[PDB]
Amino acid sequence: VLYVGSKTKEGVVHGVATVAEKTKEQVTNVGGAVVTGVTAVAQKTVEGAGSIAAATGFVKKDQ
Amino acid sequence: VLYVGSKTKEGVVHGVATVAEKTKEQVTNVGGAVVTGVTAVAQKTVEGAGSIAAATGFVKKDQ
Amino acid sequence: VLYVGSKTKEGVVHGVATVAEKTKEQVTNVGGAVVTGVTAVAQKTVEGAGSIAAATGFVKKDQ
Amino acid sequence: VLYVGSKTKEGVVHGVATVAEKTKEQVTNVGGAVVTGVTAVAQKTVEGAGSIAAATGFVKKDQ
Amino acid sequence: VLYVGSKTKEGVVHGVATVAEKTKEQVTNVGGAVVTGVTAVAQKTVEGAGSIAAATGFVKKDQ
Amino acid sequence: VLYVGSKTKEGVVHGVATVAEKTKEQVTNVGGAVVTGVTAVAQKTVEGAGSIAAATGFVKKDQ
Amino acid sequence: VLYVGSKTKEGVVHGVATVAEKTKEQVTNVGGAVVTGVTAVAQKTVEGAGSIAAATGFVKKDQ
Amino acid sequence: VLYVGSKTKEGVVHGVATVAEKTKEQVTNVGGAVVTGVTAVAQKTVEGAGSIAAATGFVKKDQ
Amino acid sequence: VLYVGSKTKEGVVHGVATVAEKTKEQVTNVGGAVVTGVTAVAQKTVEGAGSIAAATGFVKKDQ
Amino acid sequence: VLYVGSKTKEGVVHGVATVAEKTKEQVTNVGGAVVTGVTAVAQKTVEGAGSIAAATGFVKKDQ
Amino acid sequence: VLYVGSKTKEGVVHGVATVAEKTKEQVTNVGGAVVTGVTAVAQKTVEGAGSIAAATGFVKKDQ
Amino acid sequence: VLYVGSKTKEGVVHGVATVAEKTKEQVTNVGGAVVTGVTAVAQKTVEGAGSIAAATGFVKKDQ
């Protein structure tokens, strides 16, 4: 009768409606990174890092 | 009868309606990183970092 | 009667409706990386990193 | 009566409807990597990294 | 009565409907790698890495 | 009455309907690798890496 | 160049989002007529009568 | 160049999102007529009568 | 160049998303007529009457 | 160049997504007539009457 | 160059996705007539009457 | 160059996806007539009446 995990609900998306009417959508980049329009996204992570809609232009490194 | 996790609900999105009417949407970048329009996004993270809509132009490093 | 995992529901997406009417969608990049429009995406990760809609333009490395 | 895994439901997508009416969709890149439009994607990972909609333009390495 | 795996359901996609009406879809790249339109994709991975819709333009290596 | 694997269901896709009406679909690349349109794909992997819809343009190696 | 009907837009509903969270909805009548909850309703009528959400309990007639 | 019907748009519904979460919905009538919950309804009528969500309990007639 | 019907769009429904999560829906009537939940309904009528969601309990007639 | 019917679009439904999760749906009537849940219904009628979701309990007639 | 029927599109349904998850659906009537769940229905009628989802319990007649 | 029927498209259904997961569906009537679940139905009628999903319990007649 310990009930450590008796009911959990974590990282959950439910019941989403979405309408997008777009007469002209233009995404043109140079040298860069564009993220457009994610919907109903739901992750869980135990012991780690999570970047859902991430966008980097440059990543460098030295000694 | 300890009930450590008797009911949890954490990091949850539910019941979302969204309408977007866009006659012209133009996203044109150079050298950079644009994040546009995330919806109904729900993560959980145990022992880590989470940047949902992140955008960097430059990341460098030295000794 | 320990009930360690009596009921879990984690990293779940359910019940999503999506309508997209797009008369012209143009994604033309040079040198870069564009992520467009993910929907109803749900992962779980134990001991690791998860970037769902990630986009990088440059990744470098030195000593 | 330990019930370690009595009921789990993790990394699950269910009940998704999607309509996309696109009169013209043009994705033309040079040198780069474009990810367009994933839907109803659901992974699980034990001890590893998962990038669902990832896109890189350049990956380098040195000593 | 240990019940280690009494009921699990993990990495599952069920009940997806998708309609795509596309009068003209053109994907022409040079030097690069484009991923378009995956649907109802569901993997599981024990002790490994899984990138479902991944796209790289360049992968290099040095000493 | 140990029940280590009493019921598992992992990496499963079931109940998918998909309609695609495409008046003109043109995928012409040079030097690169395009993945278009996978549907109802479900793998499992014990002790290994799985990239379902992967696409690389260049893979190199040095000492 | 008369332009009798150059542009009309009449009886039009567009761009509506609605969320209803109802823990208990009970409609029990005797002898009568209940109309509950219409949304995004738009008619036009030339030479006639239109009652959109109408409800009558009794209608009689004599000589 | 008379342009009697150059552009008309009449009796039109477009771009509607609706979410309804109802834990218990009970409609039990005797002798009567209940209309519940119409959505995105759009008619046109030339020379006639239109009652979209109508509900009558009794209709009688005499000489 | 008369253009009597140059462009008409009348009685049209387009772009509707709807999510209904109902844990218990009970409709039990005696002697009567219940209409529940129509969606995305669009008629046109030239020279006649149109009742889309109509419900009558009794209809009588005499001399 | 009269153009009586140059472009008409009338009585049309297009682009509808619908998700219904119903744990228990019970419709039990006596003596009556229940209409439940029509979706994406679109008729046209020239010189006549159209009742799309109609429901009557009693219809009588005399001299 | 009269163009009486140059382009018509009337009574048309196109692009519909529908998901219905129903754990228990019970329709038990006595003496009556129940219509449940029509989808993507589109008729045209010239000189006549059309009742798509109609339901009557009693129809009588006298002199 | 009269073009009476230059292009017509009337009474047409195209591009429909439908998923129905039903753990228990029970339709048991006495004395009556139940219509359940028609999909993608499209008729045309010139000079006549069309009732697509019709259901009557009793039809009588007198002098």
UniProtKB/Swiss-Prot annotation, chains A, B, C, D, E, F, G, H, I, J, K, L:
Per the record, the domain of life is Eukaryota
Q: Where is the protein found, in the record's own terms? A: Cytoplasm; Membrane; Nucleus; Synapse
Q: In which tissues is it expressed?
A: Highly expressed in presynaptic terminals in the central nervous system. Expressed principally in brain.
Name the gene: SNCA
Q: What is known of its domains?
A: The 'non A-beta component of Alzheimer disease amyloid plaque' domain (NAC domain) is involved in fibrils formation. The middle hydrophobic region forms the core of the filaments. The C-terminus may regulate aggregation and determine the diameter of the filaments.
Annotated region 4 X 11 AA tandem repeats of [EGS]-K-T-K-[EQ]-[GQ]-V-X(4): the residues are 1-31
The protein, known as: Alpha-synuclein
Subunit structure, briefly? Soluble monomer. Homotetramer. A dynamic intracellular population of tetramers and monomers coexists normally and the tetramer plays an essential role in maintaining homeostasis. Interacts with UCHL1. Interacts with phospholipase D and histones. Interacts (via N-terminus) with synphilin-1/SNCAIP; this interaction promotes formation of SNCA inclusions in the cytoplasm. Interacts with CALM1. Interacts with STXBP1; this interaction controls SNCA self-replicating aggregation. Interacts with SNARE components VAMP2 and SNAP25; these interactions allows SNARE complex assembly and integrity.
Residue positions where Phosphoserine is found in the record:
S51
Q: How is it modified after translation?
A: Phosphorylated, predominantly on serine residues. Phosphorylation by CK1 appears to occur on residues distinct from the residue phosphorylated by other kinases.
Q: Where are the sequence repeats?
A: 6-20, 21-31
The family assignment reads: Belongs to the synuclein family.
What does the entry list as the binding residues for Cu cation?
A: H14
Q: What does this protein do?
A: Neuronal protein that plays several roles in synaptic activity such as regulation of synaptic vesicle trafficking and subsequent neurotransmitter release. Participates as a monomer in synaptic vesicle exocytosis by enhancing vesicle priming, fusion and dilation of exocytotic fusion pores. Mechanistically, acts by increasing local Ca(2+) release from microdomains which is essential for the enhancement of ATP-induced exocytosis.
- Disease annotated for this entry: Genetic alterations of SNCA resulting in aberrant polymerization into fibrils, are associated with several neurodegenerative diseases (synucleinopathies). SNCA fibrillar aggregates represent the major non A-beta component of Alzheimer disease amyloid plaque, and a major component of Lewy body inclusions. They are also found within Lewy body (LB)-like intraneuronal inclusions, glial inclusions and axonal spheroids in neurodegeneration with brain iron accumulation type 1.
